[PDB]
Amino acid sequence: GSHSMRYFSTSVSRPGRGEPRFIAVGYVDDTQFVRFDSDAASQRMEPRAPWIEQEGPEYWDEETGKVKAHSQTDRENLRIALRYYNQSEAGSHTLQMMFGCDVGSDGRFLRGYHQYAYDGKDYIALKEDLRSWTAADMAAQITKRKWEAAHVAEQQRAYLEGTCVDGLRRYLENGKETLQRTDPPKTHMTHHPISDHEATLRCWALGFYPAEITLTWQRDGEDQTQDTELVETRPAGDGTFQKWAAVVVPSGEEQRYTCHVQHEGLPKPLTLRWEP
């Protein structure tokens, strides 16, 4: 019963067009609660969950401050990136950063994260020890030797093991029903006679939080990676998730196949069989 708080930022330069666009989102577990947008009118960090709204004007002022200043810092960290890579002013470029922190059941810090990615590929990341970097290529090794000389990992480690963890414990209480409900998956099977010697069983798992759910198929207890299609877990729109898994079965042998939904809102794992 460990938890997580994550924060995803994206700088996308638009040469010739405006200043670089900056989007940024915050999550506790799989529940976004804040966002900010450099193209937005308000120019404020905004709320996207009920339990964050109950936060003082003190909060929103300070959160708008740091996000607005990651805004500007990442705009220059894109200009630096060009000079590093000798790149044309013409090109749009993406700089994503991810920072966050995990707590366990108790509330003790478990792990910190802080890292970057230029144009889809890793750039630099803080390793688990919170005292060293992982420089993806050679440009990143410039930043590495520099963030090492400047004891920047020290500074991150004081947010990660401190401030971050606090906000996580807090968010986790202010919203202890959104974030600490485990809504179990709703199960049912469907059956589409395809050709006149085959059929399709689809195992549906709808309405669950959190997203982590396992769906395996079994022909006579043995698991089947074979004639199977398994769609990515996907959002429903309201914070519940849905996944489905389906198998092509020979016609007549519908009940040689069992479906195995394993979610954490389920006391025991669910076996499912056809049955009209």
Partner: peptide, 9 residues
């Protein structure tokens, strides 16, 4: 809480 630090690559 958003990260305070803002270093440059």
């Amino acid at each position: 809480l958003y990260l305070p630090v803002r270093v440059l690559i």
